[PDB]
Design a protein around this ligand. Sequence first.
Ligand SMILES: CCCCC/C=C\C/C=C\CCCCCCCC(=O)O[C@H](COC(=O)CCCCCCCCCCCCCCC)COP(=O)([O-])OCC[N+](C)(C)C
Ligand SMILES: CCCCC/C=C\C/C=C\CCCCCCCC(=O)O[C@H](COC(=O)CCCCCCCCCCCCCCC)COP(=O)([O-])OCC[N+](C)(C)C
Ligand SMILES: C[C@H]1CC[C@]2(OC1)O[C@H]1[C@H](O)[C@@H]3[C@H]4CC[C@@H]5C[C@H](O[C@H]6O[C@@H](CO)[C@H](O)[C@@H](O)[C@@H]6O)[C@@H](O)C[C@@]5(C)[C@@H]4CC[C@@]3(C)[C@@H]1[C@H]2C
Ligand SMILES: C[C@H]1CC[C@]2(OC1)O[C@H]1[C@H](O)[C@@H]3[C@H]4CC[C@@H]5C[C@H](O[C@H]6O[C@@H](CO)[C@H](O)[C@@H](O)[C@@H]6O)[C@@H](O)C[C@@]5(C)[C@@H]4CC[C@@]3(C)[C@@H]1[C@H]2C
Ligand SMILES: C[C@H]1CC[C@]2(OC1)O[C@H]1[C@H](O)[C@@H]3[C@H]4CC[C@@H]5C[C@H](O[C@H]6O[C@@H](CO)[C@H](O)[C@@H](O)[C@@H]6O)[C@@H](O)C[C@@]5(C)[C@@H]4CC[C@@]3(C)[C@@H]1[C@H]2C
Ligand SMILES: C[C@H]1CC[C@]2(OC1)O[C@H]1[C@H](O)[C@@H]3[C@H]4CC[C@@H]5C[C@H](O[C@H]6O[C@@H](CO)[C@H](O)[C@@H](O)[C@@H]6O)[C@@H](O)C[C@@]5(C)[C@@H]4CC[C@@]3(C)[C@@H]1[C@H]2C
Ligand SMILES: *C(=O)c1ccc(-c2c3ccc(=[N+](C)C)cc-3oc3cc(N(C)C)ccc23)c(C(=O)[O-])c1
Ligand SMILES: *[C@@H]1O[C@H](CO)[C@@H](O[C@@H]2O[C@H](CO)[C@@H](O)[C@H](O)[C@H]2NC(C)=O)[C@H](O)[C@H]1NC(C)=O
Ligand SMILES: *[C@@H]1O[C@H](CO)[C@@H](O[C@@H]2O[C@H](CO)[C@@H](O)[C@H](O)[C@H]2NC(C)=O)[C@H](O)[C@H]1NC(C)=O
Lengths: 133, 165, 33, 6, 85, 236, 61
Amino acid sequence: FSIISSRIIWATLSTFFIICMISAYMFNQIRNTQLAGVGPKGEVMYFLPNEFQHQFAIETQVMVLIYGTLAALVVVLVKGIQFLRSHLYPETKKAYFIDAILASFCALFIYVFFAALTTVFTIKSPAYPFPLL
Amino acid sequence: PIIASVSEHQPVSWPAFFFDTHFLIWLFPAGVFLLFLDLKDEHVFVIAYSVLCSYFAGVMVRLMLTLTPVICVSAAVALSKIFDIYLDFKKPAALLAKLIVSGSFIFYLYLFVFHSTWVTRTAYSSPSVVLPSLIDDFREAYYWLRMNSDEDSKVAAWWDYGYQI
Amino acid sequence: MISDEQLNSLAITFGIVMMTLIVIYHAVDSTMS
Amino acid sequence: YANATS
Amino acid sequence: TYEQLYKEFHSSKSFQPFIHLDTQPKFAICGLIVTLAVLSSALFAVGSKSSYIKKLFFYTILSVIGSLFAGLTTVFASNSFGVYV
Amino acid sequence: DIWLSHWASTIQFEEYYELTNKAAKLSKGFSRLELMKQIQTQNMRQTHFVTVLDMLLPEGATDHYFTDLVGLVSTSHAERDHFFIRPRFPIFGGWNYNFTVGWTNKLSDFLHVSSGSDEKFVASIPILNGPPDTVYDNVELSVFLPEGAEIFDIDSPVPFTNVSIETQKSYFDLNKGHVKLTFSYRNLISQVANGQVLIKYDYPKSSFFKKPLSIACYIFTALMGVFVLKTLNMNV
Amino acid sequence: SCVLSVFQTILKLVIFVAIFGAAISSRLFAVIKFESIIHEFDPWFNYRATKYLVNNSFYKF
Ligand SMILES: CCCCC/C=C\C/C=C\CCCCCCCC(=O)O[C@H](COC(=O)CCCCCCCCCCCCCCC)COP(=O)([O-])OCC[N+](C)(C)C
Ligand SMILES: CCCCC/C=C\C/C=C\CCCCCCCC(=O)O[C@H](COC(=O)CCCCCCCCCCCCCCC)COP(=O)([O-])OCC[N+](C)(C)C
Ligand SMILES: C[C@H]1CC[C@]2(OC1)O[C@H]1[C@H](O)[C@@H]3[C@H]4CC[C@@H]5C[C@H](O[C@H]6O[C@@H](CO)[C@H](O)[C@@H](O)[C@@H]6O)[C@@H](O)C[C@@]5(C)[C@@H]4CC[C@@]3(C)[C@@H]1[C@H]2C
Ligand SMILES: C[C@H]1CC[C@]2(OC1)O[C@H]1[C@H](O)[C@@H]3[C@H]4CC[C@@H]5C[C@H](O[C@H]6O[C@@H](CO)[C@H](O)[C@@H](O)[C@@H]6O)[C@@H](O)C[C@@]5(C)[C@@H]4CC[C@@]3(C)[C@@H]1[C@H]2C
Ligand SMILES: C[C@H]1CC[C@]2(OC1)O[C@H]1[C@H](O)[C@@H]3[C@H]4CC[C@@H]5C[C@H](O[C@H]6O[C@@H](CO)[C@H](O)[C@@H](O)[C@@H]6O)[C@@H](O)C[C@@]5(C)[C@@H]4CC[C@@]3(C)[C@@H]1[C@H]2C
Ligand SMILES: C[C@H]1CC[C@]2(OC1)O[C@H]1[C@H](O)[C@@H]3[C@H]4CC[C@@H]5C[C@H](O[C@H]6O[C@@H](CO)[C@H](O)[C@@H](O)[C@@H]6O)[C@@H](O)C[C@@]5(C)[C@@H]4CC[C@@]3(C)[C@@H]1[C@H]2C
Ligand SMILES: *C(=O)c1ccc(-c2c3ccc(=[N+](C)C)cc-3oc3cc(N(C)C)ccc23)c(C(=O)[O-])c1
Ligand SMILES: *[C@@H]1O[C@H](CO)[C@@H](O[C@@H]2O[C@H](CO)[C@@H](O)[C@H](O)[C@H]2NC(C)=O)[C@H](O)[C@H]1NC(C)=O
Ligand SMILES: *[C@@H]1O[C@H](CO)[C@@H](O[C@@H]2O[C@H](CO)[C@@H](O)[C@H](O)[C@H]2NC(C)=O)[C@H](O)[C@H]1NC(C)=O
């Protein structure tokens, strides 16, 4: 009903499928992996340390969150600053200023999330020389 | 039972996607999303390629190679769009924001170069017939077989070492 | 022959030069058109 | 990852 | 015959090179630059929209120079990489 | 194989050996454990199997290398005038080993210029450079002179079974190629055949300068071809 | 403009030269370190087939 003809719906579906595929979603089924692990101390581990070819099943969800946030921030940087500048601050007497602020904050958040990604990757590969932190 | 035993037909864990594409891995989905908001026929080709190879690369590791071209293409689109806005100098605050964004992404480019060089030098630059420490025991026994055995001689071994022999 | 550290430095230099020149090209293409 | 047993 | 040739060999001066091997790398790196310059100019002349009777003349002279340079630098670079001609 | 080059002023030696050990065969077969127990016992006694060969090279050699039919061997070590070599496996009685060694030397030690003209050269080339105590059963000694060289006189200090002259193309031999002069000898002994072959040939300056000229003609032909390909339209 | 086009052409040529250099220098690591030798397992069959082709004819291959 005029909704399977919208570009945004199919774009969201396909991008989500690609994100789940690159987050190693098929690995958790071809191999029945545990959801998480228990530390020697006794807290939840959330990540298999020192292992590069094995993982828990919650790592897929964490990586889905990270990749989706990075992609959403890039899409907002490319297409979305106009929208939310017109919809957030309605004074429209200083509009380049608001665009600059929003773009710089988007870049800052992109850096933060890339640093988080490299941290969770150096957990699995404990000798990685570009932690970006 | 045989296709199940070869190490090249196994599923992939998530780190191997970051190990083979430093930061092109989170520009690839964004570049696909950006190709959807301007749907042309060429773009439909790229979208179908992206989806199919994404599935096939996570199901079998040897199929990750076929995924590497489109990723680059997709990434090269997204980045390019960003540079069409923040590398276009045509006012203090706007200039400063453009500088910030473009400089962060140029830094990511340089880091990509460094990471790629390190991964190549460390993981994908060693032959399996000589081991470093050199330990050269394959070529010693193969050359012994070639020098001190009859030419019409049959050597039984596991299939992994067929070709080399 | 060339050494290992020398080949590493050569590869890194080639990469850095290529990226810098593609950035300059993109800036001139986006600004002047 | 090569054409070999694991 | 052996005797005479031996006496000759043992009563003569040694071989003196034309250009020493240690110098040839510099000569190669310089000739490569000269060759690049000249050839790249003659390609500009090919792209030129001027007459045909003059494009031919300029291209031919420039190529007759660039080719001499390129051959000399090929010899020097090959000798400098360890592949002696 | 001895390669002479006037543009680089170098002489390059490449030797391909096919060695065998005619000592007693090993009863009970080879047991790496027994060999290691002999090594660590420090039994440096004179044994009848080859563990290391010592090649005696001409004075001032450089760029040594030691390979075989399966690749490059890493157990080789150069000392003044001497090149020590360790095969992949020890050579016991009845075993074979085919390998290759090579090095470079300055041309000014083997090639002299005639006194009557600056284009007549006399070369004196050693016939054997190998291990100390060895016997040879078939020797094919090839000398490669540059492209435009014309051989004028040849002589050997010991009788040979054959001699021949032909040509062979190389890395930049657009023309006929290097003049190959081949000698064939039969029964030779390591340190009693210490003579030197004498070759007198002619090499004019025209032949010296003709090689870059040939490369230049090739490049100029390619450039003329490019020009021709970019001066005719195939539009419809 | 016209100087813009010539600048872009020269820049593209230099960029592609740098691209070729970077690619080849990145691949040459194993050849520089150990030797120029054949790798893993399938390349060995490929190499023996190429040898058979270059020694014999195309019909025999
Ligand atoms: C179309 C765009 C293409 C872009 C470029 C593509 C690929 C290149 C990128 C990476 C390749 C890395 C290669 C590493 C070198 C390994 C060998 C080595 O390391 O040689 C080095 C030496 O070096 C050099 O001094 C070379 C100095 C300058 C060379 C001349 C300039 C080169 C021009 C190239 C084209 C020439 C044709 C002219 C026609 C116009 C080791 O010499 P050696 O001790 O073994 O020699 C034996 C010992 N003697 C020296 C006594 C004999
Ligand atoms: C179209 C222009 C492209 C521009 C880029 C050009 C080159 C790439 C840059 C650097 C590569 C050089 C490093 C390789 C040399 C060391 C490896 C080696 O030494 O291997 C050689 C293999 O000989 C080769 O093939 C090397 C070819 C030499 C190339 C020199 C480059 C300058 C000329 C460029 C071509 C110009 C076109 C002219 C056409 C008329 C080992 O030979 P061997 O084991 O038989 O020993 C022989 C010893 N006997 C004789 C005693 C047995
Ligand atoms: C989970 C998160 C993911 C990120 C996000 O939040 C949820 O979800 C994004 C969407 O993808 C949005 C874009 C869709 C495409 C849409 C094109 C329009 O362009 C034409 O739209 C036609 C309509 O009739 C008219 O012709 C005119 O409006 C106009 O010409 C444009 O106006 C807005 C735009 C770009 C949306 C901007 C906000 C985005 C990026 C949203 C983010 C905030
Ligand atoms: C246009 C195309 C064609 C030309 C080329 O590609 C682009 O661009 C060339 C570079 O100029 C490269 C050289 C850089 C300098 C480097 C010095 C080392 O010199 C050693 O020797 C002594 C010297 O004083 C000392 O001991 C130490 O510095 C050191 O050990 C030498 O090993 C390698 C060498 C010469 C590089 C080789 C590859 C070259 C020629 C590259 C080509 C492929
Ligand atoms: C228009 C052109 C002209 C100007 C230029 O390009 C644009 O701008 C120059 C930059 O200054 C580049 C250098 C940066 C520093 C970098 C240090 C590395 O050294 C170590 O750096 C450590 C750090 O973490 C690692 O740990 C080690 O692994 C690594 O070896 C070295 O390899 C490469 C080098 C010197 C870059 C080379 C190319 C340069 C000179 C570029 C020029 C060609
Ligand atoms: C459908 C198309 C597909 C592409 C192609 O065309 C047809 O199909 C290939 C053919 O197979 C060609 C080979 C024919 C046999 C020929 C043997 C020669 O052997 C030499 O070996 C020397 C050793 O030193 C001897 O001394 C010399 O006498 C002797 O000539 C040698 O020239 C190479 C080889 C294999 C040809 C190369 C070109 C090929 C590959 C052709 C391609 C252009
Ligand atoms: C395929 O099954 C496979 C490919 C690469 C690697 C691997 C290495 C292989 C050989 C090495 N040498 C002998 C130099 C070193 C390797 O190091 C690696 C490092 C990583 N990181 C940094 C996570 C990944 C892979 C390799 C293997 C393997 O694990 O041995 C396997
Ligand atoms: C290594 O060299 C030896 C010695 O020449 C070769 O042995 C000869 O091989 C041929 C063909 O198999 C036989 O007809 C001869 O009788 C062998 N001679 C001796 C003394 O054994 C051997 O073939 C060479 N191996 C390789 C791989 O080239
Ligand atoms: C000396 O010269 C060659 C040694 O290479 C031999 O004669 C030739 O041998 C090749 C080898 O197959 C043949 O193809 C030629 O037909 C032979 N003859 C000629 C004229 O080249 C032989 O050992 C000697 N030839 C003599 C003494 O005539």
